[PDB]
């Protein structure tokens, strides 16, 4: 559920 | 030339903890991130975390932050992975994986795993 | 383990192409969740082969590509060679970590 990208990746 | 190298192993009492090292070569250390996974043949691989030798930056899987612990040492060139209050369930293969984040997104060069054994 | 899921084993022949796919089970796999797909040869040399859906990692041969495929992730290898046998790994993003699927054995009849 959780996904995308970020400052983390 | 881009190289990782771990030990191959290492034998350890329950309630102990060890510090695994990752040497590098071959490239300019700072510039690129460092992930660990760890490896049980039985059921595969898993993400214990990244750091950034360049700040130092962190990121960690929930379930391994009381476990683990990673940090750099530059100008030896090599990543250390310190775990702790081991168990038997923290028997298993350990790599380093470098990897490129930029307009990129990857994992290329791992090293060969250190198998760490955790009995009494 | 948030859980990816690979074809257990496959087989080809050498100069053909086999596709290995990768499913999420939060649902359909997307470019935000930055595909990687990895090999594993004997005695746990482990290389980076795809990055970010399809960014090919360098010293990496031609004939390795990345896609989607429905609502999946795919590894496409055109022309398989005998040295191709070997296990591949997936791994996607969920936000603030990566979760690996089970590996596809692949056999390349050589």
């Known amino acids: 559920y959780q996904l995308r990208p970020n400052a983390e990746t | 030339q881009v190289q990782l190298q771990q030990p191959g192993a290492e034998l350890v009492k329950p309630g102990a903890s060890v510090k695994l090292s990752c040497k590098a070569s071959?490239?300019?250390?700072?510039?690129?991130?460092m992930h660990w996974v760890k490896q049980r043949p039985g059921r595969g691989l898993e993400w214990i975390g990244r750091?950034?030798?360049?700040?130092?930056?962190?990121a960690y899987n929930e379930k391994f932050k009381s476990k683990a612990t990673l940090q750099v040492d530059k100008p030896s060139s090599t990543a250390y992975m310190q775990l702790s209050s081991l168990t038997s369930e923290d028997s298993a293969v350990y790599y380093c994986?470098?990897?490129?984040?930029?307009?990129?997104?990857?994992?290329?060069?791992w090293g060969q795993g250190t198998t760490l054994t955790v009995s009494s | 383990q948030a859980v990816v899921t690979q074809e257990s084993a496959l087989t080809t022949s050498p100069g053909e192409t086999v596709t290995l796919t990768c499913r999420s089970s939060?649902?359909?796999?997307?470019?935000?969740?930055?595909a990687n797909w990895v090999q594993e040869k004997p005695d746990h040399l482990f290389t980076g082969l795809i990055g970010?859906?399809?960014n090919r990692a360098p010293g990496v041969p031609a004939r390795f590509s990345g896609s989607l495929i429905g609502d999946k992730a795919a590894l496409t290898i055109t022309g398989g060679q005998t040295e191709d046998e070997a296990i591949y790994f997936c791994?996607?993003?969920?936000?603030?970590?990566?979760?690996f699927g089970g590996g596809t054995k692949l056999t390349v009849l050589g």
């Open positions: 071959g490239y300019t250390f700072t510039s690129y991130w």
């Open positions: 750091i950034d030798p360049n700040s130092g930056g962190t």
């Open positions: 970010g859906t399809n």
């Open positions: 791994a996607l993003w969920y936000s603030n970590h990566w979760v």
């Open positions: 994986a470098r990897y490129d984040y930029y307009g990129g997104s990857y994992f290329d060069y």
């Open positions: 939060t649902g359909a796999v997307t470019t935000s969740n930055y």
